Structures are given as structure tokens and as C-alpha cells.
Write a protein that binds this DNA or RNA. Structure first.
Lengths: 192, 191
DNA sequence: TTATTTGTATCGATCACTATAAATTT
DNA sequence: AAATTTATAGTGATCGATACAAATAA
């Protein structure tokens, strides 16, 4: 067939930014096409629909802005330092001038119309993973000796995931990076 | 002609639609069908979808935001104030009488530029949450249950962060026991 | 062919919102 | 009657999603 006249991954990144800022439903087809510099028929050719475009953009976001999460967790000598460096780097990215403020998974679709309930549920599932990720590192901690064997791994994981989701909301509110880092250290104070 | 609907009950229904669907996600169809009124009546009473949301937000704050300051000021220490506030808030977030999560956090975090006002409004209210903590801690400094050199803005922001995160978690159907454990864990960070 | 993409033109449905007039009070 | 609030029906605009034919490949 005719060769594609646009980079698919670049269009995915630009569609991902529009979602990151306006949310799944707030990002209209007009705003998407104007940012991806393509036309609606070209979009539906490639991606399939707004829902499908968002699922590809979320998969792309998790592979580009979700890699550092597991990398800094497993790259620390202790589970506490893993959680510490993860929260610090997550605040650095939430407050960086290169990326939109906050996490896409948290801000994109918390509520909305029934039509998007699938998208919403999808994001919810990903938030669940944010807990499991924490838990897994803590598990390794228990094996490494830096964490007690009887610690409630899912309680700590849920707590630090709660702090993570709260940090997205605070970063959307333009809370200074210094105060968000102070919040991270305060949250680390709650470690057993 | 007498109006065929009570304004406060219509605001109740409208705020429920906003609580589940958010500001832009709540269409006029879903709003009018829940309030059991017609679009001309809605626009004569409130003037605009944004006006309806502002009235519903004021009503929601007078109904589900008045207890915050009362529970904070009703405790002997700032620690117990924050503790009982978080525990009560979890109890409401996990009850089946109200939609799970706080409306101020869930209604509009992102959206179209056209709704910038609404979002900013909610943001302001979120700020007040921090203030509600800060003020109490100030009293805690005077009463002597909090150190004078306590970094209040870090502590207030931390517990407000936990509060906003609890709204998100309550939306994700996290059980009440898990959220209560999260609160008791967040209290361990207290100085 | 045989197939696929691209730009122009939309499609019906739904959005927030309202002009007009009947209905219901004093 | 006079003063409001309804209900009907529909406003332009925009929503996500497409025909259609020209355009570019195997």
C-alpha cells in the first residue's frame, strides 16, 4: 500500500502529551489531530479510535515514564532507599519543566461519563500495579534482610502508593518542588 | 407561578451527578434527569452549567466540609485532631451512603481549557485543606502539644497529600480497613 | 491490478444553551 | 388580568468517527 507519511511513535508521543494535560475525555479529536499534525482519517487508520489511541499512548507512557520506577526501586541497596529514591525522582519529574505536572495514570480519568468507564478502569488497574511494584521491592527487602519478615508488605505499599497519588494532585496544584521533597522525607519517616 | 422543585434538593441531585461524573463529564441530560427539572428551569435558577457547579460545590462544602474544622478544633491535641479527621474522612470515603472519594479531588483534575475556571476553583479548595491542617497545628504550638520549631507547612502538606491520595484510593475500591491502616501509618510520621 | 494512506468534505449524535409560548400562580 | 415558571422544540457548535476520490506504493 501507500507508505505512511508520518512517524507513528512521534504521533503517539504527541497524543500522549495532549492526554497528559487534558485527560482522556478532555482531549478532543481536534486537539489530538492538531498536535499530532495528522488528519482524522489518518488517525483511525493507525490507531483505531480515541479509546485505542489512548491505550497505545498509555502503553507508550508506561514504557517511557514508568521505566524509572522499577529501575530505581530495584537499583537501591535497601527497600527503604528504593522507596525513598523513587519518591524523590517522582517529585523531580512531577516538578520538572520538561514534562506536564503529575502522573498521567492518576490525572487522566478519575471520573467521567459512563462511556469511558473502560478507560477509567484501565487506569485504576495501573494504579493497583503501583502498589504491587512497591510490595515486590519490599519482598526482596525481606529476603535481603533490610526489612522485617513479618512486616505487612501491602500496608506499606498502599501507604506509599497513597503518598504517590497525593503527590500527583499536589504537583497539578503547582506546589513547589522543595515542599514536595519535604513531604517525601516526612513520608519516609513513617517507615518501620 | 410557584416553582415545582426545591432548590436545595435539586442541588443535592446535581452534586451527586458531579460527584460521580465530574464537572465536564456530567452532561445536562444526566443533570436535568437527576434534578427532575428542565433546561430552562435550570438556567433560570443557576444561569449556567458552571454556575450550577459552583452552587453545588458550595452546598457540598456546607454538607461534607463543615465537619473537618469541627473535628480538628474539637480534639485536645493537633495530633488527635489530624488523626480523628483522617479516620472520619476514611469512614465517609468507604460508606455506601456517599460516592467514594472527595468531590474536590475527583471532579476536575484535568479537562478542556474551556473549564479552566472550575479546575482552578477546586484547586483553591484543596489549598484550604492544607490551611485547615496548618491552622490547627498553629493552635497545637500555642497549646504546647507541638514543638515551636515544627515545620508546619511540611506537616500540613504531608497530611493533605495523604488526604488527596485517600480520595484516589477510595475511588479504586480499596477496603476501609486498608485505608484505616494507611491513616495510622501516616500518623507515624508525626514529630 | 491490489492495497493502503491522505486531504477535503463531512456524517449523525450530542454538547451547552435558549426563543417562544402554554400553564399556573396572585 | 399580571407576573413567573414551566415545557416544547430547536439553536449553532462540537463531539467521535467516516465517505469519497486522489495519491502513492507493491
Amino acid at each position: 500500500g501507500r507508505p505512511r507519511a508520518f512517524d507513528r511513535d512521534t504521533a503517539l508521543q504527541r497524543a500522549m502529551d495532549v492526554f497528559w494535560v487534558r485527560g482522556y475525555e478532555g482531549a478532543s479529536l481536534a486537539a489530538l489531530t492538531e498536535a499530532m499534525e495528522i488528519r482524522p482519517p489518518s488517525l483511525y487508520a493507525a490507531f483505531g479510535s480515541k479509546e485505542g489511541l489512548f491505550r497505545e499512548a498509555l502503553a507508550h507512557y508506561l514504557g517511557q515514564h514508568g521505566r524509572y520506577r522499577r529501575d530505581v526501586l530495584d537499583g537501591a541497596p535497601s527497600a527503604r532507599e528504593g522507596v525513598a529514591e523513587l519518591l524523590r525522582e517522582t517529585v523531580a519529574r512531577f516538578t520538572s519543566d520538561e514534562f506536564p505536572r503529575g502522573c498521567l495514570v492518576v490525572l487522566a480519568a478519575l471520573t467521567g461519563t459512563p462511556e469511558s468507564e473502560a478507560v477509567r478502569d484501565a487506569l485504576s488497574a495501573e494504579r493497583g500495579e503501583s502498589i504491587r511494584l512497591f510490595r515486590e521491592r519490599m519482598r526482596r527487602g525481606i529476603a535481603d534482610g533490610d526489612l522485617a519478615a513479618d512486616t505487612d508488605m501491602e500496608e506499606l505499599a498502599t501507604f506509599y502508593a497513597t503518598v504517590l497519588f497525593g503527590l500527583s494532585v499536589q504537583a497539578k496544584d503547582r506546589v513547589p518542588r522543595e515542599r514536595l521533597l519535604a513531604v517525601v522525607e516526612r513520608a519516609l519517616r513513617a517507615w518501620p
